[PDB]
Amino acid sequence: MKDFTTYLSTAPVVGLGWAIFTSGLLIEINRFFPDPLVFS
Amino acid sequence: DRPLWYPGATPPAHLDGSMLGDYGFDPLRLGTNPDRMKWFREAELTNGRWAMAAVVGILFTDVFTSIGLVGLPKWWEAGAQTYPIDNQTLRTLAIIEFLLFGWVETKRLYDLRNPGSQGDGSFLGITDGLKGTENGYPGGIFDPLGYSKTSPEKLDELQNGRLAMLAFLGFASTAAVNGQGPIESLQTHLADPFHVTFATNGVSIPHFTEF
Amino acid sequence: DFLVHHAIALGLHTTTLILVKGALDARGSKLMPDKKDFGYSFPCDGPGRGGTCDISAYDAFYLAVFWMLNTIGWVTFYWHWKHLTLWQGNVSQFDESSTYLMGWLRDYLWLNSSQLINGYNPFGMNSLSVWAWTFLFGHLVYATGF
Amino acid sequence: EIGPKRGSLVKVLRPESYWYNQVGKVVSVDQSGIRYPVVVRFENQNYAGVSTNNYALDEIEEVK
Amino acid sequence: FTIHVTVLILLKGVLFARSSRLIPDKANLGFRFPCDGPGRGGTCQVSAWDHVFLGLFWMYNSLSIVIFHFSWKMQSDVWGTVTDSGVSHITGGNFAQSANTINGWLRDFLWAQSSQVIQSYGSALSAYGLMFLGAHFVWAFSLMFLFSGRGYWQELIESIVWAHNKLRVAPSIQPRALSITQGRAVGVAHYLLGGIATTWSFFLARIIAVG
Amino acid sequence: DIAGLTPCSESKAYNKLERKELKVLDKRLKQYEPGSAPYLALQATKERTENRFKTYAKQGLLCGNDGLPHLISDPGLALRFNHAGEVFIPTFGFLYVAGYIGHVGRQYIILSKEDAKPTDKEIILDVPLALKLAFQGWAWPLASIQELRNGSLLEKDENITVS
Amino acid sequence: DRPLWSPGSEPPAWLDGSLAGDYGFDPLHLSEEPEMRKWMVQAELVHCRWAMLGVAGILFTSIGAKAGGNFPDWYDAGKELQKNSDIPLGSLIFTELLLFGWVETKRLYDLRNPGSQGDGSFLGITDGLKGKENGYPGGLFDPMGMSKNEASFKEAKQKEVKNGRLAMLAFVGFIAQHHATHKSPIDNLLDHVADPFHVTFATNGVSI
Ligand code: CLA
Ligand code: CLA
Ligand code: CLA
Ligand code: CLA
Ligand code: CLA
Ligand code: CLA
Ligand SMILES: CC1=C[C@H](O)CC(C)(C)[C@@H]1/C=C/C(C)=C\C=C/C(C)=C\C=C/C=C(C)\C=C/C=C(C)\C=C/C1=C(C)C[C@H](O)CC1(C)C
Ligand code: SF4
């Protein structure tokens, strides 16, 4: 398990979790309060 | 060191040393370098001391307002009530506020840089009274009540000052989504607590679940 | 006109960077501490040190010309279309369509290349046949350099 | 002893070198009159892949 | 002509992989190596790997023509709607007259059948209009890699490392420019991808919107 | 108003563009049945389109002769004519986020280089440390001026030069 | 030396047998490290203790509904009770989230640092509010002296876990045989007792 967690700490995997967060956050930020252009 | 903001196991690194209102609360570690920790300490005081004397004008007066003794306006619209008065003092107030504070504050700014640095003949004849005991706690400004040896009445100054800094942030936020004054907001939480809150009525969260 | 000016600035700044580098790093680089001994124009210093192909200052000028042509292209594409809409009377063509790239491909390039391409048709030939022939002649010479 | 001590860090002053104004450990020093006796080892590689090079007395100076 | 040439590039690489007159010992250098050196007037792209890297562009060019032949021939002479009086082909049977000229392949195939892709904005085929442009970007982007060399780039990174070093934010893994062999591979990849994806957009949008 | 631009509420082409974009959906809506899912999808798009146009008008935007909204960049004209949210305020929002990425990556680089084998820490990250710094960077401007006024931000001629 | 989930299988090295409810069951090699193992035993118990506390609430109501009392199904109970309540939704949530953040956070820092909450800061309580073990506190949460004996405390830990694993399996049952039958759990029981051979999962019209 120590080696599995180490594999998960590689660059390709940590980047995959980052991408799901940033993309998931932005798509969710467009789904709610739809299509923003001016900021109030 | 006074008790810890977390009761359990949040070891602070540089706050074990002596300081006022030390509860070990610095997650972001903005007080590591001692030179600027010395600067942020004075900032907590000027914000603390100023915020408290400000909160009274909102608090001591609006209590008398809700009871009906006086007909003063609320703080969210006190500014637009002054200048339409016939005998008024239109906005040369922003600049005079800066010309007057600029004289005092730079005298305070040059004290933190050079403590006790007020020359002999610089002011007319009161050069001696302007010298201070410590940074943030001068001598000749208070007339009584500063000769005790256990000087930490200061802890009262901070716990009261930090508290008021929460007040104005709550006054400003309450007065931006509730639309009413601070005391009027209090009379409602007492009359109907569960209905008037930040969740359901005060739109601080998008809660629309009608079922 | 705002986006076109900003695009130009990018071309002018990058073109200078390609040239300025070839000048200041002409005397020496960490990869080649003594360029000055070789000259302005040489092949490379070999496959060693990971590879040294296109280091000389001649190779910086070589790469800037591509950008130069790219920069003047934008500058010139912006002059022609903004003036055609003025001469044709329909200024609204540029203002609404120049904000997105497909307008440049649809309304400027593809549209105005109709009378030209029909210079020599299978039915007949107009006076613009010499230009359509040259039109392709350029398209070909450009590819032979590749 | 002729030169710097074993295991001592030193800063380089060859303008040609990949390690210029950079620090490295002294691996060894020869005291037989060689022109470039001081052997130095760095962690970072050069462009070729070599992490050592023999420098001179005048070309090296104390750290930082 | 495009097949006999594509064989010349690959077959030459095979037979001259092990040894040649210019370089009697290639086998010791290996399968993929960029060059022996600037000597002999120049030895860059002499390996068998670099023959494959060249055969790809020809192979791609040869295959593209075998596709234009299928589209214009079948649109003009074969496909179409049958009416009471014969068949009405899509392009009116213009393969016989226009194809003999190169300008015909520019006018009647490109400048004509590109109307469905260009005018796709605002419809279900809008994705093909985007890919039509995106494919041109990746195609050109490859030219930076094929035309230039790893020397200019490795020096540029040094001036960038200075700024990253000046702020004490630099990678322990040293940055190094792409290898000569990789640079060539990166070119043909982005080159073929942009060259092939254009047709994939120029065909499906043309044909789905029939005629 | 300013620069010879009309507000989007008063413009005719702005409303012309609304009537056009809705007409496309109404024609597309005629094909399908009322209670079907394609009908619900298009009605939602109709609802969003009607909301996009009224919100841009309500926000005091400026539409030109073409009928599309234009943005203003000078903070003086933006603040004078109440157009600050367009560009002037988006600039501060981004800089706080951009600085956060820099202050975080700079700290992970410095701290891993204080230990043995920093090369391995780049390809195989210390995720507990990276998350710690990522949640400590909310007040990145304070630390920068703290580090600038102190002098531990910049290095001093201990860097490689080329000549 | 003890029973196992599959007789004859070699138990893992890290599962020595001291923990409560240890049968050598960890094929994914989770809780192989000490720190994660220290976290999971506390996660298992809260997932257990909440199951017992919740499932009993479902049986009590579903039995009272079958007897005649006015109790709704455990499903669609939060929807019909909020329609006619003086407490709006949102004021009820953040009364729960805010009140649990106190407890759930104090429990965390006893995990990261045992004996830390017994400093006496919280209302001058020191002997209580310090953990006896990881997930097993005492003093205040054990008013009856039912844990001051290691002989009777070690087997009680085995019963807390065995009646717990069983409990949070039952909650998965309620989810499943509700989606199939859309009836209460007790009603599904009396049907099986009425005609056991005919009414099973095979004849519900689902799962086939
Ligand atoms: C720190 C002092 C303080 C106090 C006593 C209050 C009190 C109140 N606020 Mg308030 N508020 C505050 C700060 C404060 N606020 C701040 C700093 C903000 C900005 C983040 C807000 C934003 C806010 C909104 C948006 C709304 C209220 C509302 C209300 C009222 C109903 C309760 C509620 O919604 O939950 C309060 C919700 C919060 C998120 C603040 C609670 C967190 C504080 C910091 C905890 C402090 C601990 C404890 C209470 C201190 C005791 C002090 C006491 C003995 C004097 C009530 C009179 C509602 C209203 O309309 O009034 C009728 C409402 O809609 N508040
Ligand atoms: C489409 C063709 C193309 C493109 C896009 C570029 C782009 C660029 N060139 Mg260039 N070049 C080209 C052709 C091209 N060149 C050709 C044919 C030659 C002659 C052979 C040169 C010779 C040349 C030289 C000598 C130099 C450049 C430089 C540059 C960079 C300048 C800085 C800049 O503009 O910031 C960026 C500009 C962009 C357009 C951004 C491109 C990336 C976009 C944003 C995509 C974003 C990624 C996105 C998330 C998709 C990723 C997914 C994928 C990874 C799977 C730039 C990125 C200069 C440089 O080094 O910069 C410092 C430089 O010195 N070029
Ligand atoms: C299964 C196929 C696969 C694919 C498509 C990739 C792709 C990639 N790997 Mg890789 N990897 C793989 C398998 C794969 N890997 C395997 C089997 C192993 C052995 C365990 C590794 C071990 C490995 C290591 C050790 C490293 C990579 C790295 C990389 C990236 C190259 C660095 C770069 O160009 O961006 C450059 C990036 C920058 C200049 C700034 C960072 C910004 C990035 C682009 C954001 C993160 C992108 C994100 C990962 C994209 C999502 C994943 C994507 C494939 C869908 C690249 C995206 C390198 C890397 O750092 O990954 C990013 C790297 O160090 N991989
Ligand atoms: C030998 C294989 C081969 C061949 C035959 C061609 C042929 C062609 N390619 Mg090319 N190409 C190839 C390989 C090949 N390609 C490869 C491997 C690649 C990279 C993968 C490319 C990439 C490529 C691109 C990017 C382009 C072409 C284009 C073209 C066309 C040029 C358009 C033209 O000039 O019209 C016909 C030319 C004429 C009518 C003029 C003829 C000039 C004559 C021969 C010279 C006469 C001079 C004069 C008489 C002397 C005067 C003397 C004095 C007394 C006045 C042409 C049909 C272009 C294209 O697609 O067309 C739109 C284009 O831009 N190709
Ligand atoms: C902490 C990481 C980091 C930091 C603090 C900086 C900081 C800086 N860079 Mg830079 N750079 C980085 C990473 C970083 N870079 C990477 C990964 C690359 C390879 C793509 C580059 C390529 C690069 C170039 C070509 C240039 C700079 C330049 C600069 C300077 C101007 C800002 C800029 O526009 O850069 C550009 C910004 C980017 C190219 C985006 C970088 C990609 C992401 C957004 C940042 C990476 C964050 C990291 C992966 C996250 C790790 C966090 C950790 C906790 C795990 C500035 C001081 C410019 C300069 O020289 O200054 C004058 C310049 O020309 N950088
Ligand atoms: C936790 C224990 C448990 C218990 C006591 C029951 C009991 C019951 N279930 Mg049920 N069920 C459970 C878990 C359980 N279920 C789980 C976890 C699921 C999801 C897979 C289901 C899915 C399910 C469906 C879909 C249906 C039932 C039905 C029924 C009833 C009739 C029996 C039948 O058709 O066999 C079905 C039995 C199973 C599918 C086996 C369930 C799996 C557990 C692990 C069985 C063993 C439990 C335990 C270890 C031993 C008993 C303990 C104790 C009584 C001695 C009966 C009251 C039916 C009904 O509505 O009755 C009319 C029906 O349609 N159940
Ligand atoms: C939120 C909210 C909302 C709702 O609505 C309402 C409520 C309930 C109210 C809430 C709030 C609360 C708070 C927070 C606060 C308050 C108060 C304070 C803290 C202070 C005052 C107040 C404070 C203060 C300090 C004042 C005063 C004091 C002082 C000392 C002064 C002066 C002096 C000095 C200097 C020194 C000298 O030698 C002497 C003398 C001269 C004597
Ligand atoms: S590929 Fe580059 S380094 Fe190799 S011989 Fe050619 S120019 Fe020189």
PDB file of C-alpha atoms in Angstrom, chain B residues 39 102-115 117-118:
ATOM      1  CA  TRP B  39       3.888  46.036  12.699  1.00  0.00           C
ATOM      2  CA  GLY B 102      -1.929  62.818   7.833  1.00  0.00           C
ATOM      3  CA  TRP B 103      -0.389  65.037  10.495  1.00  0.00           C
ATOM      4  CA  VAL B 104      -1.003  62.619  13.365  1.00  0.00           C
ATOM      5  CA  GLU B 105      -0.479  59.261  11.678  1.00  0.00           C
ATOM      6  CA  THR B 106       2.947  60.075  10.238  1.00  0.00           C
ATOM      7  CA  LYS B 107       3.921  61.128  13.753  1.00  0.00           C
ATOM      8  CA  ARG B 108       2.823  57.626  14.734  1.00  0.00           C
ATOM      9  CA  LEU B 109       4.501  56.103  11.669  1.00  0.00           C
ATOM     10  CA  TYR B 110       7.851  57.698  12.535  1.00  0.00           C
ATOM     11  CA  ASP B 111       7.547  56.479  16.133  1.00  0.00           C
ATOM     12  CA  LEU B 112       7.504  52.795  15.188  1.00  0.00           C
ATOM     13  CA  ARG B 113      10.553  53.439  13.007  1.00  0.00           C
ATOM     14  CA  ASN B 114      12.420  55.484  15.653  1.00  0.00           C
ATOM     15  CA  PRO B 115      10.856  54.910  19.108  1.00  0.00           C
ATOM     16  CA  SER B 117      12.012  60.079  18.590  1.00  0.00           C
ATOM     17  CA  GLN B 118      10.417  63.471  19.161  1.00  0.00           C
TER      18      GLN B 118
END
